[PDB]
Structures are given as C-alpha cells and as structure tokens.
Amino acid sequence: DNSILDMRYENNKFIDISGYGSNISINGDVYIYSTNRNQFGIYSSKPSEVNIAQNNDIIYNGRYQNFSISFWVRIPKYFNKVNLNNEYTIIDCIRNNNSGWKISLNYNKIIWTLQDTAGNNQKLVFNYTQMISISDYINKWIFVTITNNRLGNSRIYINGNLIDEKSISNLGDIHVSDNILFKIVGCNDTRYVGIRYFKVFDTELGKTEIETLYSDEPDPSILKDFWGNYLLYNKRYYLLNLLRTDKSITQNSNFLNINQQRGVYQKPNIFSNTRLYTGVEVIIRKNNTDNFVRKNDLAYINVVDRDVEYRLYADISIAKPEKIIKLIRTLGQIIVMDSIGNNCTMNFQNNNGGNIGLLGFHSNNLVASSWYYNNIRKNTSSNGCFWSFISKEHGWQEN
Numbered sequence: 001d002n003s004i005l006d007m008r009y010e011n012n013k014f015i016d017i018s019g020y021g022s023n024i025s026i027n028g029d030v031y032i033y034s035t036n037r038n039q040f041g042i043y044s045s046k047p048s049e050v051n052i053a054q055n056n057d058i059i060y061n062g063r064y065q066n067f068s069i070s071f072w073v074r075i076p077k078y079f080n081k082v083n084l085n086n087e088y089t090i091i092d093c094i095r096n097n098n099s100g101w102k103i104s105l106n107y108n109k110i111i112w113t114l115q116d117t118a119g120n121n122q123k124l125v126f127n128y129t130q131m132i133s134i135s136d137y138i139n140k141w142i143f144v145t146i147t148n149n150r151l152g153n154s155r156i157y158i159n160g161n162l163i164d165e166k167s168i169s170n171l172g173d174i175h176v177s178d179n180i181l182f183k184i185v186g187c188n189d190t191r192y193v194g195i196r197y198f199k200v201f202d203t204e205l206g207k208t209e210i211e212t213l214y215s216d217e218p219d220p221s222i223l224k225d226f227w228g229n230y231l232l233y234n235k236r237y238y239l240l241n242l243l244r245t246d247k248s249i250t251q252n253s254n255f256l257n258i259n260q261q262r263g264v265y266q267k268p269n270i271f272s273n274t275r276l277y278t279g280v281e282v283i284i285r286k287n288n289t290d291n292f293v294r295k296n297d298l299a300y301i302n303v304v305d306r307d308v309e310y311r312l313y314a315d316i317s318i319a320k321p322e323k324i325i326k327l328i329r330t331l332g333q334i335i336v337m338d339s340i341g342n343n344c345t346m347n348f349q350n351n352n353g354g355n356i357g358l359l360g361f362h363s364n365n366l367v368a369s370s371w372y373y374n375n376i377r378k379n380t381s382s383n384g385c386f387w388s389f390i391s392k393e394h395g396w397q398e399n
Helices: 207-216 370-374
Strands: 005-010 013-016 023-028 039-043 048-053 067-074 088-094 100-106 109-115 121-127 141-148 153-158 161-167 179-185 192-201 237-241 247-251 256-261 264-267 271-274 281-286 298-305 308-314 322-329 333-340 343-350 355-361 366-369 387-390
Touching: 013 023, 013 048, 039 048, 039 179, 067 100, 088 192, 100 141, 109 141, 109 153, 121 153, 121 161, 141 207, 179 192, 237 247, 256 366, 308 333, 308 355, 308 366, 322 355, 343 387, 355 370, 366 370
Parallel strands: none
Antiparallel strands: 005 013, 005 192, 023 048, 039 192, 048 179, 067 141, 067 192, 088 100, 088 179, 100 109, 109 121, 141 153, 153 161, 237 281, 237 387, 247 256, 264 271, 281 298, 298 308, 298 333, 308 322, 322 366, 333 343, 343 355, 355 366
C-alpha cells in the first residue's frame, strides 16, 4: 500500500516488494511453510536467521520521524522450566547495542523496546497467560503493530486492539540499526518462532489502517484452522464449538453429543489448559488446484472413526427448527463453508439449495438449525454455530 519496507518470500528467497530498495539475506536453516510461503520459522539452537540490510533512506536517526512496524508471530506453548524467566530477542534493530528498537519475547510476554542514543528508553508489553481454558494466543498467529508518534506516544496493538501506550517524550535521538535481524538471541531452550508479513511504515498508523492490515493480509477468502493457518480439505481435525469450549464432540449411536467434558491438561507452574485433542476426528471433502477451503465452498464433513468415514447428515424428517445430525457411512445434502473472522460456519442445504440450518447444537446433541440464521451475536465468537478445526501439531503437545 505505502510501506517503506515490505518483506515477502517469493521464488525461494525473501524480497522487499515495497520497491523501496532494502536487501534481504538468509543464514543457516530458515523454515518455510508449504501452505503459505510467507510464513517462516527461525530456531534458537542452530544457525538460523533472516537479515534485512535496510535502505540508507529508512535508517532513521533524528528525533521527529514517526514510524510503525507490523507483523504476525506464532509462539509455541512453553512447556519447560527453562522458559519461565528468560527474555530473548526475535527481531533486532538495535545499533551498537544502544539506540534503536527490538521485539523480544519471554514466558507470557511480547516486548517492544525503543531507545535513543543517550540511553533513554521506553518499553511496551503485551501480557498473555498459559493458565487459561482456551487461549487466543498460544501457538496461534498473533498480529502485532507498534506505532510511534515522536511528539506523542508509542502504542502496541495486538490483533488490531490497542493494548498499551506510553509517552516517548523522554526519547531524543533515535538512530536505528542498518539491519533488522530476525533471529532468536538469548533463549536458553530449544525453541523456534514463526513470523509472517513483516512491514515498516514511515508514519504512525491509525486504528483504521491497522484493522485493515489485520483482516486483509492473510487471504480473507480462505477459512482458517484453530491456529490461524489455512483450513484444508482432506485433513483430519478435532472439533471445537465456540459456545461450549469445555465440551468434547463425541460419537454416540449414530449421533454426535456435546455434553462430555474436554479434560484439562497441565504442568505445574508452566501451563493448565482444557485439552484440545479429544473427541471425534473430522475430515472435510470437496463437493481444484489446491486444498484451501474458501468462503462459499460446497463440501461434505465426515467423522473418521477407525479409518471409516461417516457423513454428517441433517435428519430433515424431524420438522422442527433443529434437525439432529446423524452419521451415515459413505448422498442428498451439501454444506456451504464460510467464516466470520477466524470462526467457521457450516450451512446445511438440501440438493435444491434450500436451507436446512447452520451446524450447531441444541441440547446435548449436534444439529443443523435454522434458528441461527437470524440469531448470530455480532461481535463475539460465542455462538453455538461457530466452530474451530484443531489439527494436532508440534507447537502444542498434550498428554
């Protein structure tokens, strides 16, 4: 749009597509996601780094240049005592170990540091926890945005929302580094972090600008899985209902219940969360060039039980607004895929396109209900028809 630095990974290499003129290099082993090449990972125990040699024109020095930075970061769940009080840098733009800025992490924190040549500094911190039933942050892509008004405050936004701000009137000459180094430094454990869509702007981004970056960067037409990655067809997932997050989805007779508790998994003083990997496993099948599930796609949802797939079927014989879901071994119906932010919805329709109802639950059983069409709570994920697909991954391990 108008950033002075915009890093993307294209054609097997990082590049500043802003056309402003910064050069980027890689060193050691840098992980590149196959589903989204713009997502890369860096490690703490072996040579691994990405370095942007900034165009001389963006190597700010004075005391009046406003600037902002934005990027998404994914941090695996911490599970070792060594992680508890160990702050490590991930993005470094500090000059001679003094002036500039850097983004660093620590157990339960994302830290921004801005410092001038005289040593005066200001820090902004985002706090999150590992003692929580369901986390919107642990091992999920988190959108960060720091904005700096030299005549005002520095501000930190998380997923488009202002978390904290402080005056930087105590800051004089800020001289950033010639380089922006993406590398884990100071971490005492074997760890990695994921990052994507890093950018730098030569103005103080406003709330509106940031919301756009938040909803527009990852392809908005593609549904997301529980972690924030692209939702995929032909891939096994566990199910999570956003209204009943402490409940597991289990196979009864040919029905699916949602009254059983998802256990809790914890490790004293490190974490305590509701268990994610539990309940039935589901797979999404297409009704052409990739396996990304897009808004309005027509698909089938099957429960995979002992390698045998069973189609979720909305029993339309009932005649109530709630059509109880039943399992029929693999028809007559189709599901329209869609999303509300990171929330996924599945709309059952008959072969004629007539609406049956959004997948949700009534009492202790899953159902397709037309009640949802006119009863969706606007700005919350707390809707019985809102779902999340959880894929078992290395970044989040359980008992």
